[model samples]
Target: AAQTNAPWGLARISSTSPGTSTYYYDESAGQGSCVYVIDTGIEASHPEFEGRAQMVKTYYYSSRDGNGHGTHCAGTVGSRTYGVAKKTQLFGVKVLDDNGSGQYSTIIAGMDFVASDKNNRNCPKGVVASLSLGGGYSSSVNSAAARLQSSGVMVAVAAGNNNADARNYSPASEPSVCTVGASDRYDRRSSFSNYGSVLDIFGPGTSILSTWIGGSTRSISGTSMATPHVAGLAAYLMTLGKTTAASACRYIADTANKGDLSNIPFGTVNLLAYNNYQA
Candidate 1:
């Protein structure tokens, strides 16, 4: 059964309430920008995401559009009316094939595509890549991601959905990468979310609603959902000229709702406080 009755509503709730958007708005208004989504592939025509997806570049390395994971992830980050960065442009890069699986080479190729858009005719400047997929930590992937970071592209990765102390692979564990874990509606860590010092922040990842294929909707759970919340927030921050990944992460950590400090891993990131930190 689908995890949610209204995926669109779920996306909106995750983005706008107490998580990423609150912090972004507190910092500054999101002026609409572009973000790169390297996942399975997005459902470009979903009502919640229609006219909102700006495809700068696209590739189907292993899968096509039938798989809904990428679409759902994309919706969480950029879907209009239901996402944190609704006004931001999205560049979809399909590395994993229809089966939700792909080789490392394919993933590297996708990253290269987004990073090497020298023509400026495809993806614009100030583009941040939001990655929600991973197997385990890999030095190769981390190195590649670092290359992208050096080029001024921020990468947000999932810390894995294993629900154990064990960290996930490659990019998420990488120090340069912004790893995100999952939190429930109450802002408690989801049982399935992987955790450790490696985790940079938490987002609404449990029972997230998003766009699926054929104009359908579904609710899914995982750290996958949490990754986009950060990604969307990064896009919003970029609109305010907060360009570096470190700065964006710091802003989120400082501004998060710091209510239940004992429950969360990082001692309750207070978005509201972080927003008013400098004030």
Candidate 2:
């Protein structure tokens, strides 16, 4: 793997505060960690993820990016400019095809494989699986995610962009996974994001700008954009010596800045994500 270090403002992911135009500096972060992007294939050659990303189909054979969603999410998870842990390796487990979509069956299978990739001692237990893709609820998917979490692998999932209740969704409602919602630059929950008690946390999703396909960058909205930010944080937590996914989730909840959401309803104060540069 390669090495990277950045100045800090965020907890450890973005140098600037999430959602603001403060433009992140970079966190002097860790290396040898890995972030698993469970979505469309990543453009392995994307400048930001170069030498740090590997592509695999849902079967663990091989995989690519025509829709650019994977590349963007991958960037947010670990890229230099738009990442949380800049030096972490990224594994692209392609369940979604070139259309920015996928099936839950293949998605769960891919998640299982990512968790099973525990032999990579460099990554310790396993990479954090970042899923920016979602549809409806699937109990089987929840079961698989729980298996990963219980096994110590962190899975960051989107809470759905439907503006409905995330409890009605898959992976998001899964007890084992860290379900993320979208928040605007002003720290308000995204109007388009689904919410509920199941919502684990909130990340910058409205008008988020990050790495894109075709060796470029783009701005996209949705819980899709927010999920990767949490995945990146999972990596950041891992680098700080947190072992299990459960621990990372706990730390995130504990260290979260609740002031931003204090005015919101008690049911909605999903901790605001941050990076502790010194941690």
Candidate 3:
């Protein structure tokens, strides 16, 4: 394993303890996998990407990332400098607008687009989606996300930042997706993170430093930041032959560092995301 300077979120997943401020990972990383950042959009030219990020498909007039949310999430997913899976191909799927808002129909459309990519022969073998947006319960959105999962794209989603039950949200409440909660450096749940039985995993989400829209970087916190960490791990797992959505989810939960979090809601899972690259 090689240890390199990295964001705390990237470093935390590799180490069993909190003090390691660098990422420890193997060279194989996520060579043959692809991750769909289904959010606002991505700044594909950000220096952090080093030409690995692309805007292969977009539903909007332009794929440009004006809001920076998707770019930040994408960086956490697979940017060269700030990501977990450094070799995973990043695809910007603009489901939401620049203001970080979208209707259920638009969200469903993005899911369909991902399904098409999953079925495409040219697409990478291991496909995963990092969705950081959620609204109150919507069966249509949930169904679309479920269909995407059935079509072979592993889905990882934020468990909402509402500080309430994640069961009240759309894709987050969808049992088919790997819903993630936010945890701090101390392995304590962030007070704003939604919890309950809907959560499948947790990741570092507080004050996360990542790529932004202007080819720069910034720090922000939300379950949105945490979800992509799992998606990145899923991409890494895909390279190891956990190719299917179900299989990747199973491996993520099975290999997670269990019961390491505090301040979690009573019904929420206490498992923290781990890359199995312990020092």
- Write the residue-wise lDDT of candidate 2 on 1-279 in tens digits: 122333122232332344333334234344756788888888889888757887855543447677789888888887877776777888888888787666788888887877777555368534678888777888898888888777777788899988888888888889667888887766678888888888877877777767888789888888988888878877876776754566776677667666564233457555777654431
Sorted by TM-score, highest first, which candidate order results?
A: 3, 2, 1
TM value for model 1: 0.81
**lDDT score for residue 56 of model 2:** 54
Q: Write the per-residue lDDT of candidate 1 for residues 1-279, one digit (tens) a residue.
A: 011233332322333344332222332324445677788787777787757664445445333466888888888777754466666777678877778877887788787777786236333325678888888667788777777666667688887877654355767777777778777765567778877777777777888877777887788988888888778777776776655554676667665655542255453232311222221
Task: Name the runs in model 1 displaced over 4 angstroms.
Answer: 1-29, 54-63, 118-125, 166-168, 242-246, 259-279
Model 1 accuracy (lDDT, Cα): 0.66
Off by over 4 Å in 2: 1-28, 59-62, 262-266
Pairwise TM-score winner, candidates 2 and 3? 3
lDDT of 3 by residue, 1-279 (tens): 554677888888887776578898767778878899999999999988888888766667888888999999999998887898888889988888888888889899999899897665344558899999999999999999999888888899999999999999989999988999999887889879999998899998988889998889999999999999999989987876655666787788888888888998777888889888744
lDDT of 2 at 248: 74
Assess every candidate by TM-score: 0.81, 0.87, 0.96
Return the TM-score for candidate 2, rounded to 2 decimals: 0.87
Model 1 C-alpha RMSD to native: 5.4
**Regarding lDDT, does 1 or 3 come out ahead?**
3
Sorted by lDDT, highest first, which candidate order results? Answer: 3, 2, 1
User: Can you tell me which runs of candidate 3 are displaced by over 4 Å?
Assistant: 121-125
